Swiss-Prot record, chain A:
Its main location: nucleus. One of its GO terms (molecular function) is histone H3K4 methyltransferase activity. It comes from Homo sapiens. GO terms for cellular component: ATAC complex; histone acetyltransferase complex; histone methyltransferase complex; mitotic spindle; MLL1 complex; MLL1/2 complex; MLL3/4 complex; NSL complex. The gene is WDR5. Changing F233W: Strongly reduced affinity for histone H3. This is WD repeat-containing protein 5.
Curated annotation (Swiss-Prot), chain B:
Component of the DCX (DDB1-CUL4-X-box) E3 ubiquitin-protein ligase complex, named CUL4A-RBX1-DDB1-DCAF1/VPRBP complex. Interacts with DDB1; the interaction is direct. Also forms a ternary complex with DDA1 and DDB1. Interacts with NF2 (via FERM domain). Component of the EDVP complex, a E3 ligase complex containing DYRK2, EDD/UBR5, DDB1 and DCAF1. Interacts with DYRK2; the interaction is direct. Interacts with RAG1; the interaction is direct. Interacts with LLGL1 and LLGL2. Interacts with histone H3. (Microbial infection) Interacts with HIV-1 virus Vpr protein; the interaction is direct. The modification Phosphoserine is found at S248. Belongs to the VPRBP/DCAF1 family. WD repeats lie at residues 15-54, 57-98, 100-137, 139-171, 172-214. It is found in: Cytoplasm; Nucleus; Cytoplasm, Cytoskeleton, Microtubule organizing center, Centrosome. Signal peptide: none annotated. Residues 15-214 are annotated as: WD repeat-like region. The protein kinase-like region mediates the threonine-protein kinase activity. The DWD boxes are required for interaction with DDB1. A motif (DWD box 1) lies at residues 166-173. This is DDB1- and CUL4-associated factor 1. Acts both as a substrate recognition component of E3 ubiquitin-protein ligase complexes and as an atypical serine/threonine-protein kinase, playing key roles in various processes such as cell cycle, telomerase regulation and histone modification. Probable substrate-specific adapter of a DCX (DDB1-CUL4-X-box) E3 ubiquitin-protein ligase complex, named CUL4A-RBX1-DDB1-DCAF1/VPRBP complex, which mediates ubiquitination and proteasome-dependent degradation of proteins such as NF2. A motif (DWD box 2) lies at residues 202-209.
């Protein structure tokens, strides 16, 4: 059955470009981060204007929660990660040590370790309950566009502008594998499949590839969208059908079929590049955020 | 090989959800090696069912075992993780000897077990057990058949290799025949008698390259012989859709074939999904891993006596 994405609520109130959105591990709240230095909370079905968080001096590129949906880690253009008490917005800790912008950040399933990628051209393993930096991995020869943790937490997947997707052993820090396409276009986003066997990865020649990363082969490649300059965060969809969703640089959000690479559904409406999208853990909900010419979030619900 | 008497069963010890995922009779008499869904390699008394040893080998489910004939070495492959395939020493103490970090399937040479042959996608890598040197790298893009489930294999005399449906002369490392691609996944094995090649449902002649036999029921099966290569066993695979729920590689039944004329013998349905099956060194036993189901896997080794 093909989806029926229906625009439900639109969220405005961001001073500048908004760069990252996420649903709660519970899915009652939508957390957004903006180049406006702000992190904001909204009603994850109704889109209600919740609290708004503050303390980062520069812009924020991305925002992740922990397993219990109790702390966010924002990654800011002020070289800083900060852990926030969602309940109050009182910044729990300010992780420090990167040399340049920090663009990607995430936790592990046990909501204790931080993974950050940065323009300092490194990745870093942090300790959430103390904020100390455990590991500096000279990850790539360039700025690091995404960092993700698998359903257990013994592997780090990293993206880089150098076309190098990469997989890391957390408990040791060793470089387990090293993906390369035969060509070397940059990779702007990466994450694990919810089942852990596979890896979504976006590249800037309008490409979005699914990978089985231990056999080292590309098992499918979805295209049609526009991705040449910006690092759009793409997602899977295993709630109803098994889909692939990703914003784009013609201010649309494209959806393909996970297992047949075909352009199942399209969602227009934004005014600028759609930079972020997430999908609710439980429900069939799509979030989407765009840059300064839009500065808004928008919600889509599908029956499947 | 049409009658199959239950002889013993056992499940994984101390584990509410038994995770045996492959088996192979060790060179030691009354003992089977089972890899488990969680990287481990267990040692079991095939008759009592008692667990004798346990070795963390990989950090993902073990897919393939192959004990060496002389008892001293073991190969393991995994699903994901470094290394993908590992070679373990076994003489009185279990330690790693080598590791093939990119081969997703590994197997000993046949005649003298003086070389491991490993598969990476469409590529074959022969290694050397004492040193671990990659002696050869067999692949030819102009001839590749891109078998989804390719496994490069040695012939009985180690003279030839087969890999992606291409026949290789090992002495000259020159491909000497491509066999036409008639299926998406199965790459073929060499018949134990060394005179013929079984690629999915095609049985080709090794000397003339003639079609000798069509065997439709071997479509999509892995194949295993009894020690004497007089009985053939075929378990059919299942299937790519959806995310993961620990899906059994084979369906619920297997088949036995006269290894000489490919005429069928029996169909054996155990009414449970099969993960692996193997035959012993003395031609008495077939041992099969069988999922019982849970809320997601719960397997038991059943040891059958062949009749």
């Amino acid at each position: 059955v093909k989806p029926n994405y229906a625009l439900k609520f639109t969220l405005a109130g961001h001073t500048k470009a908004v760069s990252s959105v996420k649903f709660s591990p519970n899915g009652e709240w939508l957390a957004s981060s903006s180049a406006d230095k702000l992190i904001k909370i909204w009603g994850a079905y109704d889109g209600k204007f919740e609290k708004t968080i503050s303390g980062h001096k520069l812009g924020i590129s991305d925002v992740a929660w922990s397993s219990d949906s109790n702390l966010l880690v924002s990654a800011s253009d002020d070289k800083t990660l900060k852990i926030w008490d969602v309940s109050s917005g009182k910044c729990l800790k300010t992780l420090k040590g990167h040399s340049n912008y920090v663009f990607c950040c995430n936790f592990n399933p046990q909501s204790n370790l931080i993974v950050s990628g940065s323009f300092d051209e490194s990745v870093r393993i942090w300790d959430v309950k103390t904020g100390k930096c455990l590991k500096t991995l000279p990850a790539h020869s360039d700025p690091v566009s995404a960092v993700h943790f698998n359903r257990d937490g013994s592997l780090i997947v990293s993206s880089s502008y150098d076309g190098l997707c990469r997989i890391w052993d957390t408990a040791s820090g060793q470089c387990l594998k090293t993906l390369i396409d035969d060509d070397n276009p940059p990779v702007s986003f990466v994450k694990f499949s919810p089942n852990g066997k596979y890896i979504l990865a976006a590249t800037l020649d309008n490409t979005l590839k699914l990978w089985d990363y231990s056999k080292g082969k590309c098992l499918k490649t979805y295209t049609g969208h526009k991705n040449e300059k910006y690092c759009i965060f793409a997602n899977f969809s295993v709630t109803g059908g098994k889909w692939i969703v990703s914003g784009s640089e013609d201010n649309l959000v494209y959806i393909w079929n996970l297992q047949t690479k075909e352009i199942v559904q399209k969602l227009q409406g934004h005014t600028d590049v759609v930079i972020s999208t997430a999908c609710h853990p439980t429900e069939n909900i799509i979030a989407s955020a765009a840059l300064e010419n839009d500065k808004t979030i928008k919600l889509w619900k599908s029956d499947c | 090989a049409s009658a199959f008497r239950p002889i013993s069963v056992f499940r994984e010890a101390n584990e509410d959800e038994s995770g045996f995922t492959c088996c192979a009779f060790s060179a030691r008499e009354r003992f089977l090696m089972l890899g488990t869904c969680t990287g481990q390699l267990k040692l079991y008394n095939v008759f009592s069912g008692q667990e004798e040893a346990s070795y963390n080998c990989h950090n993902s489910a073990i897919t393939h075992l192959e004990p060496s004939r002389d008892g001293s070495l073991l190969l393991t492959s995994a699903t994901w993780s470094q290394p993908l395939s590992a070679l373990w020493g076994m003489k009185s103490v279990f330690d790693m000897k080598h590791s093939f970090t990119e081969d997703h399937y590994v197997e000993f040479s046949k005649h003298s077990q003086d070389r491991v042959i490993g598969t990476k996608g469409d590529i074959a890598h022969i290694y050397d057990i004492q040193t671990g040197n990659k002696l050869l790298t067999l692949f030819n893009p102009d001839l590749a058949n891109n078998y989804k489930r390719n496994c490069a294999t040695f012939n009985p005399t180690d003279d030839l290799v087969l890999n992606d449906g291409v026949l290789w002369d090992v002495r000259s490392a020159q491909a000497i025949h491509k066999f036409d691609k008639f299926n998406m996944n199965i790459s073929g094995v060499f018949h134990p008698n060394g005179l013929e090649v079984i690629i999915n449902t095609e049985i080709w002649d090794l000397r003339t390259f003639h079609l000798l036999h069509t065997v439709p029921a071997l479509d999509q099966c892995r194949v295993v012989f009894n020690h004497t290569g007089t009985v053939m066993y075929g378990a059919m695979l299942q299937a790519d859709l959806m995310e993961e729920r620990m899906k059994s590689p084979f369906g619920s039944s297997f088949r036995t074939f006269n290894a000489t004329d490919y005429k069928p013998i029996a169909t054996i349905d155990v009414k449970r999904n099969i993960f692996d099956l193997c035959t012993d060194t003395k031609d008495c036993y077939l041992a099969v891993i069988e999922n019982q189901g849970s809320m997601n896997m719960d397997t038991v080794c059943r040891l059958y006596e062949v009749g």
